[PDB]
Amino acid sequence: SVDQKAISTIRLLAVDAVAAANSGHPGAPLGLAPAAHAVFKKMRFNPKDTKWINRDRFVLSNGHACALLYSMLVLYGYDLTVEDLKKFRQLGSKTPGHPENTDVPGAEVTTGPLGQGICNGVGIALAQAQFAATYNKPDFPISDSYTYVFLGDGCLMEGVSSEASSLAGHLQLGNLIAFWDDNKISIDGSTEVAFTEDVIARYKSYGWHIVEVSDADTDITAIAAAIDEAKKVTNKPTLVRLTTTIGFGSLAQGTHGVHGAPLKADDIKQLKTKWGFNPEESFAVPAEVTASYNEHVAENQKIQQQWNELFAAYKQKYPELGAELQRRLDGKLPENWDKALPVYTPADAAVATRKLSEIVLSKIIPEVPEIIGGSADLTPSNLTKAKGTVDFQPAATGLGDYSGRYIRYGVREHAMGAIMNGIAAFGANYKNYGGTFLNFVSYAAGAVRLSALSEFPITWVATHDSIGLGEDGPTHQPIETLAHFRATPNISVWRPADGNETSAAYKSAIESTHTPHILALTRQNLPQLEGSSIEKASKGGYTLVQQDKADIIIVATGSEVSLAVDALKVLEGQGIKAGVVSLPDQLTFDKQSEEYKLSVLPDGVPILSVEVMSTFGWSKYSHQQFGLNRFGASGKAPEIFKLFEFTPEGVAERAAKTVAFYKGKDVVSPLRSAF
Amino acid sequence: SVDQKAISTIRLLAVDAVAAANSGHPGAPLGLAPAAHAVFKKMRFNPKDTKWINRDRFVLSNGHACALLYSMLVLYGYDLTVEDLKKFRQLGSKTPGHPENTDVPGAEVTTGPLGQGICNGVGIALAQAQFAATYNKPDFPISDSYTYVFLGDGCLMEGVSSEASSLAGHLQLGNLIAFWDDNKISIDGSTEVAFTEDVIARYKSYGWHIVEVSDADTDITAIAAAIDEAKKVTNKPTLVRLTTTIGFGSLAQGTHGVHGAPLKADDIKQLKTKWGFNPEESFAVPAEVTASYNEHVAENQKIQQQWNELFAAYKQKYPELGAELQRRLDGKLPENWDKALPVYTPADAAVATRKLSEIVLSKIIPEVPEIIGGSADLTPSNLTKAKGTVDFQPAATGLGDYSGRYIRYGVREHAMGAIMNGIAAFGANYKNYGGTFLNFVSYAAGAVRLSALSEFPITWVATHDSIGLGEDGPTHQPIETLAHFRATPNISVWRPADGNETSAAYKSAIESTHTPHILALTRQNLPQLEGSSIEKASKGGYTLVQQDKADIIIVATGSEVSLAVDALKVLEGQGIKAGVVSLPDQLTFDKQSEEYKLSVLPDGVPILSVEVMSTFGWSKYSHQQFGLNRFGASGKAPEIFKLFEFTPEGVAERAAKTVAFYKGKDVVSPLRSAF
Ligand SMILES: CC1=C(CCOP(=O)(O)OP(=O)(O)O)S/C(=C(/O)CO)N1Cc1cnc(C)nc1N
Ligand SMILES: CC1=C(CCOP(=O)(O)OP(=O)(O)O)S/C(=C(/O)CO)N1Cc1cnc(C)nc1N
Ligand SMILES: O=C[C@H](O)[C@H](O)COP(=O)(O)O
Numbered sequence A, B: 001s002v003d004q005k006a007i008s009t010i011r012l013l014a015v016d017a018v019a020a021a022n023s024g025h026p027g028a029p030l031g032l033a034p035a036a037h038a039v040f041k042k043m044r045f046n047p048k049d050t051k052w053i054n055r056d057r058f059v060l061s062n063g064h065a066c067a068l069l070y071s072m073l074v075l076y077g078y079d080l081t082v083e084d085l086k087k088f089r090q091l092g093s094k095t096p097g098h099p100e101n102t103d104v105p106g107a108e109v110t111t112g113p114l115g116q117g118i119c120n121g122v123g124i125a126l127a128q129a130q131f132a133a134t135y136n137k138p139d140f141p142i143s144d145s146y147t148y149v150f151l152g153d154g155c156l157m158e159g160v161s162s163e164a165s166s167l168a169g170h171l172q173l174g175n176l177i178a179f180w181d182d183n184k185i186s187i188d189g190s191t192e193v194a195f196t197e198d199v200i201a202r203y204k205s206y207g208w209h210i211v212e213v214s215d216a217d218t219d220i221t222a223i224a225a226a227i228d229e230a231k232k233v234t235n236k237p238t239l240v241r242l243t244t245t246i247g248f249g250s251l252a253q254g255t256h257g258v259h260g261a262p263l264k265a266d267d268i269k270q271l272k273t274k275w276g277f278n279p280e281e282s283f284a285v286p287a288e289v290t291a292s293y294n295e296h297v298a299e300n301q302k303i304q305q306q307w308n309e310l311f312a313a314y315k316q317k318y319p320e321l322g323a324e325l326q327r328r329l330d331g332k333l334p335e336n337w338d339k340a341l342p343v344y345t346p347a348d349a350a351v352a353t354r355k356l357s358e359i360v361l362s363k364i365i366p367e368v369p370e371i372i373g374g375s376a377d378l379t380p381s382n383l384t385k386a387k388g389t390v391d392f393q394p395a396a397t398g399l400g401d402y403s404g405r406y407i408r409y410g411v412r413e414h415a416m417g418a419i420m421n422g423i424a425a426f427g428a429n430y431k432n433y434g435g436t437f438l439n440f441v442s443y444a445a446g447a448v449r450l451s452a453l454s455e456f457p458i459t460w461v462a463t464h465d466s467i468g469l470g471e472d473g474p475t476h477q478p479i480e481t482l483a484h485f486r487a488t489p490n491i492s493v494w495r496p497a498d499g500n501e502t503s504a505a506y507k508s509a510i511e512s513t514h515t516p517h518i519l520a521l522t523r524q525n526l527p528q529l530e531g532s533s534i535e536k537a538s539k540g541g542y543t544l545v546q547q548d549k550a551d552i553i554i555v556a557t558g559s560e561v562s563l564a565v566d567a568l569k570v571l572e573g574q575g576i577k578a579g580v581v582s583l584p585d586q587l588t589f590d591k592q593s594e595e596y597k598l599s600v601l602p603d604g605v606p607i608l609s610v611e612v613m614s615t616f617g618w619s620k621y622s623h624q625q626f627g628l629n630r631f632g633a634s635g636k637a638p639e640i641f642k643l644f645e646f647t648p649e650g651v652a653e654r655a656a657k658t659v660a661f662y663k664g665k666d667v668v669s670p671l672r673s674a675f
């Protein structure tokens, strides 16, 4: 049949791509080609408009199987061709060894790190439910799309997927349909060696619906029927168990050796002949397969054309909501939204930056509907919920509604991070955030790094940033955390010192379109600074206190800026004149012009950094670094600062020693380099 | 009864400790005091010998509830007193806000970061099973101890606990008995808001046994009976559901407000009167409670005394095993074990450091029985299994035995990291390791940081360290990872360049008693270096190529040392003389004497670092840094190195620019500082 020919075409494209690279993973593509064929024939999508907001989404969580995804995208006429398949895994190609949303048309998210994609699919589905609840009206199903996810045994072993699956079942996300490649093989061999749990019973315990397809190597009728059944279960995400043979058709089918290495040339020949293909030919695409797939594309394009007319009618019937939706689909924030950001003066009271953050959210959430967010069981500590909003929950629970804006993630940092990436991936200008303590953002490092690589504008509201949290002690007090994320490409790590800087940090986080943000916020109160403003803090680094005859400049962030200002006064009594630089975001600063940066960190003056965490990275901006390179302590926060000499006198002492160390030396800016 | 009085004493000690600190968590201590009383009365332990190797272990995974643990330790006469309880959460005290194994007698592990302790308990139980299988003989139950873990809803939501619970059920760890504080309250309120899964059905799906105690606020008879039942189920770990009221007895019992803040003074008064205590008194310890607890200690001490005689008899009956066991309990490695480490010369072939690691393990595993380890589903890629060893599996599976030495962790990096901490915590000189790709050690950051804070000598075998892995691409290629762990206090991050350095790295990792190690190892082959040795590499940094008239020194690690040596030859043709420093472990280097370090990085010469990852940290050792501060690429590894100019000519060009940049300048060692 043409369906059988399509499945064979998919299998052979994937195997030929691996063969040409002499690298990659043929096994799961061979096992999942029937399911991929069946799912894509049920999906609504436009290869010529990858951003249609009512498309069904597909996520390949077992990202190593990407030769399968690339074959589907090629066959359906996305902006990816057989010539790109021939360049699988080659430097600069559109077919990298794991799918990247920035590089691959039709890749919704970046996968490859196991467990992430299923959680991203939970986030795409969460966003779709929230979006539909916000916009749909009687006779106007603006959003009614599904989220289809393929995943394997590896994803099911990673804890992040358990977190997201428990939450998805709690949230009754009936438009999520996941498919487990139940092939009983991972890299270390049989799953009997390490993965003997009853997966199906576990997913029932989360409140998922189950469909089992016992012969997923051939039974596309049953795979299609499983999708139909899943769509009838509107209050549970569904897991479809696809019992497959890894490497189906290979001489080496059913073995770990087919997971991750190219097939032998003679194996490829026998695959082709058994399926009616020419064993002398590679990258064959039968015209009948193209015709069948083109039929489905043309049908989907007529569906999108009708949706465009529905959207035009919606804008007539619901003028305000229609304009809001149009603005969001254009990627634009509300005009002058930032006038809602709070502004402070030095006469205002001291406030913790966690509380300043709460106040910002309280002002901007009502003004910017595409902001949604939550906390990982730390809502009253991170201060992430605006009073008066409703939680995102299924209405059946009585605890919220899908039109809600606040997500109770539970104690699930890693899944929260990957769900945020899925919410961003949904599109529609979502600007979403997640709260936890800064030290526990580290639990989610797998997802955070993917936010950076995927260029998603997600925001971590990361409170309790330092030893300033006090009594909870060294298990809770960050030391390495800012260095880790600052050393990751494309992460904006804001550590605002006061109210104006906190507003600048949120202006950056909400305006972002390609850079994730971590806002490192305090438990303890900080004074409003003389010289701060949203304008200057928006530069990432700025001169807070200018001193034309400076003997030293102190550069600091967050809670240590006020400390630097107090140290300036101690130094004045020692006959030393200091300037102060505030550096709320190193990434934003680094992106300013060279002349702007040199105006902040000039030649001819020693520069001392002060930040109560690791000194790593700080030599980019300073000659000497005062930091904390040991674990913290359990005690009242002011006593910890005193113990580690983060006091005005301790900073002044190190500043005076820095001035003395450079006497008789020529000093150039830390910004200078040899190359 | 005296039991009722003991429970009240525990509850009131914990509440009074929180009250004195005006900080901490009274709710779970109040709810779990009956269970704590019942479990400690079943446990065998010696407060005067916290290291008795056949003790039962207790782990408080819900570490915020530590006022409960500290109260039990005080009541049983550990080296912790009521005066220490009065200093709960105060700077420098023995009663920090979360338990720390380095500081608290009777704290087996450091908890506080949720999910960790239950996984540590899995590791303690895994080690006990392996230890018992290694040493027990007929009539000689050298090891027969249990592992008891308390955990709450937060731990059950963290994915790391799902990973370890799935693995523990697969491993049939019948001496693990966990207790879930089923109180339906977390920080964000009712568990109905985010945690509605059927926990019991999930744990059945992992192959755990279940006992439910419906009235754990009072029914110590049923808690004791649940322990007895769990001990009869020798092939499954058991979860005991303790249905409790958080803050039991408080006016605010059953609310989130009692989770995490001190009780009101009038609430404490009514608690005391309802339980027969004087509301005017704090930190009361009734003598009858002390007497009852002392009885149990005296019984346990007689059990340990009999075990000591059993051990003496074992040494007579099994002379070789007895001496091995004695050596391990003394904390000593076999005499001259390190003579088994492979040594290489520059005439030997190029080898990837992952393969060199395999070879080391193959030589040292047969010589050092306390080495055990595994991989997170990457055994044939990390090369972590010595040929001929047997896997650690229950014999009932046919796939291994508990006397085995190789652990199939599955795709569970975070749980592997926390399980390794539990294996180390068991004691008996275990030197245990876990393999994954370096980029995915980041999945386990929560546990890795705890290895450092807890001072456990665990080892990550972290292969595929850089863009040198090639085609898998930027989702797999570390950039930030070494900076992150180097910036964490107390982590030895070895990045060996060749065979001799790899042996030095393992000598350090296996000799360690207080510092975790990460070995960053290559996929790709590297040459044996002229000038390397175990002796010099053991210093952490050393002069590989000495040049008395150096115009520049190049400092490098790992794969970039050979690159630096090749660049030296290009520079010689440009009229520039270079020295080379190899820095296989920055922590080890930093611990050398100041004069040794200055002999490696002297004054008077520009120093350029070369490492194909983040430049963070490198200014400690260099004036200029050549690194990779952007994500990688999917392609053949040599082409990626060429793209980023990590070539002999690219290094030489930056070295020449560095020499020119310092012309006419006075240069002092990067090791100098102002303070
Ligand atoms: C262990 C693992 C594989 C087995 C999957 O086993 P599986 O999901 O059952 O797949 P399959 O056998 O049915 O094909 S792939 C993978 C690749 O490096 C190719 O991406 N690694 C390494 C791996 C480890 N940990 C994380 C977080 N992500 C990973 N990517
Ligand atoms: C969310 C969380 C709490 C609720 C537990 O909720 P729970 O386990 O049901 O406890 P309980 O209500 O019955 O007392 S405590 C905790 C403390 O900061 C006191 O350690 N945090 C923050 C927290 C978040 N994430 C990690 C990895 N570790 C944490 N420590
Ligand atoms: O569990 C409680 C944590 O210790 C808590 O959230 C810290 O509370 P805080 O907001 O007072 O810092």
Ligand SMILES: O=C[C@H](O)[C@H](O)COP(=O)(O)O
Pocket (backbone or CB within 6 Å): A064, A187, A260, B378, B380, B381, B382, B472, B523
């Ligand atoms: O899944 C396979 C990963 O891509 C694999 O383990 C890498 O294999 P390697 O050992 O050839 O690098």
Ligand SMILES: [Ca+2]
Pocket (backbone or CB within 6 Å): A152, A153, A154, A181, A183, A184, A185, A186
């Ligand atoms: Ca599999």
Ligand SMILES: [Ca+2]
Pocket (backbone or CB within 6 Å): B152, B153, B154, B181, B183, B184, B185, B186
């Ligand atoms: Ca609870």
